[PDB]
Amino acid sequence: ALKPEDKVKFRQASYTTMAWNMGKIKAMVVDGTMPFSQTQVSAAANVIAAIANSGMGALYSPDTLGVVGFKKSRLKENFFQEQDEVRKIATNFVEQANKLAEVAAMGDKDEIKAQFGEVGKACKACHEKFREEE
Amino acid sequence: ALKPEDKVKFRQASYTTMAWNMGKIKAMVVDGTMPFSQTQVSAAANVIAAIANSGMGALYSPDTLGVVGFKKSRLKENFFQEQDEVRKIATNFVEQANKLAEVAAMGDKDEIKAQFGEVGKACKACHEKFREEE
Numbered sequence A, B: 001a002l003k004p005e006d007k008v009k010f011r012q013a014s015y016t017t018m019a020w021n022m023g024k025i026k027a028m029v030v031d032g033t034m035p036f037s038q039t040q041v042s043a044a045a046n047v048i049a050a051i052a053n054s055g056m057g058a059l060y061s062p063d064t065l066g067v068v069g070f071k072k073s074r075l076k077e078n079f080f081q082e083q084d085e086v087r088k089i090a091t092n093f094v095e096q097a098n099k100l101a102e103v104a105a106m107g108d109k110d111e112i113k114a115q116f117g118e119v120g121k122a123c124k125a126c127h128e129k130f131r132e133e134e
């Protein structure tokens, strides 16, 4: 199976990959710091949905607490104490990510901006709660 | 725009995310060390295709040579000298990744194994050529 170090690397890599693709959508539909491209915004949305559906629950186990992947894990132990809250936030994130990829395929900038805002809220719902602040 | 350090982190994260998802397909259709799941193999294929289509060419510029992302970049300078060879290998990889996601949606283990083998060859075609060995 996967060593703890690999579980942490693979989840840090997955989240960092989503963050690159989230920044590209933000640049094109929120900040206008990149030209709007239907192809590029859809491609970025599709990465977020695919990773959201990739079964990242397999990368979460107690033996990953405090373990270095690319860097020391920022997972808080309360993740293992609050499984009802984790299920609520995770299922919400998958639903919002799926919707973003659906909207971004042919949606206009304002439709995408609305769906993107719901995904951003879903990402943020793990902050301070399950991820150590920095 | 993106600092060199961010370009290296985002490309290292993208490749590591594909490697996690490639390992899951290998376990289910090549080594039989994980139970075959149509849902899970399709989800893993969809991550690889989505990242392959994510425009990772934006993360490649000469000012990323020798720069630390998660770790010091393993990009070789000959990437910038061999753009015809890079275009051949990159377009091949996108084509094979798209085909893997198409096959993995309803394909059987042997169909997926064949498409997965073509993607593995496409990943390997950047080795020693554009990525430093270790």
Ligand code: HEC
Pocket (backbone or CB within 6 Å): A008, A011, A012, A013, A015, A016, A018, A019, A022, A048, A070, A071, A072, A073, A074, A075, A076, A086, A089, A090, A093, A119, A122, A123, A124, A126, A130, A131
């Ligand atoms: C809880 C169910 C989460 C959801 C939904 C998202 N993230 Fe997250 N993120 C979470 C944890 C517990 C951690 C720490 C991982 C570790 O082991 O250290 C993170 C981390 C990140 C990071 C930093 C990654 C790194 O290289 O170290 C980023 C950039 C990040 N997360 C972004 C992010 C985005 C963009 C999300 C929505 C698309 C998202 N996360 C969801 C917990 C959760």
Ligand code: HEC
Pocket (backbone or CB within 6 Å): B008, B011, B012, B013, B015, B016, B018, B019, B022, B048, B070, B071, B072, B073, B074, B075, B076, B086, B089, B090, B093, B119, B122, B123, B124, B126, B130, B131
């Ligand atoms: C050339 C067009 C590439 C293709 C196609 C793939 N990879 Fe690759 N990979 C490449 C470079 C130039 C590098 C170095 C990146 C850097 O800046 O250091 C890599 C790196 C990886 C890594 C290590 C990532 C890390 O955390 O440091 C892995 C695990 C990796 N690559 C895997 C991989 C897979 C599975 C691919 C096909 C699905 C794949 N790569 C394609 C160049 C190229």
Ligand SMILES: O=C1O[C@H]([C@@H](O)CO)C(O)=C1O
Pocket (backbone or CB within 6 Å): A019, A022, A123
């Ligand atoms: O590191 C971070 O991860 C999340 C996500 O938004 C990534 O962009 C966040 O809010 C950060 O500053």
Ligand SMILES: O=C1O[C@H]([C@@H](O)CO)C(O)=C1O
Pocket (backbone or CB within 6 Å): A019, A022, A023, A026, A119, A120, A121, A123, A124
């Ligand atoms: O606007 C954004 O919100 C998401 C989310 O991660 C918020 O934390 C993200 O990374 C963006 O670019």
Ligand SMILES: O=C1O[C@H]([C@@H](O)CO)C(O)=C1O
Pocket (backbone or CB within 6 Å): A126, A127, A128, A129, A131, A132, A133, A134
């Ligand atoms: O790295 C960060 O730490 C805090 C917190 O959200 C982490 O959970 C924050 O807002 C960041 O961007």
Ligand SMILES: O=C1O[C@H]([C@@H](O)CO)C(O)=C1O
Pocket (backbone or CB within 6 Å): B019, B022, B123
């Ligand atoms: O680090 C590696 O990256 C490629 C890829 O196969 C990832 O699994 C490879 O062959 C490695 O050992």
Ligand SMILES: O=C1O[C@H]([C@@H](O)CO)C(O)=C1O
Pocket (backbone or CB within 6 Å): B019, B022, B023, B026, B119, B120, B121, B123, B124
């Ligand atoms: O069998 C595999 O091949 C790919 C490719 O990266 C080969 O280098 C990979 O990572 C696998 O699990």
Ligand SMILES: O=C1O[C@H]([C@@H](O)CO)C(O)=C1O
Pocket (backbone or CB within 6 Å): B126, B127, B128, B129, B131, B132, B133, B134
């Ligand atoms: O890390 C590795 O270095 C060599 C080379 O392929 C890198 O380009 C190899 O086969 C690995 O798995």
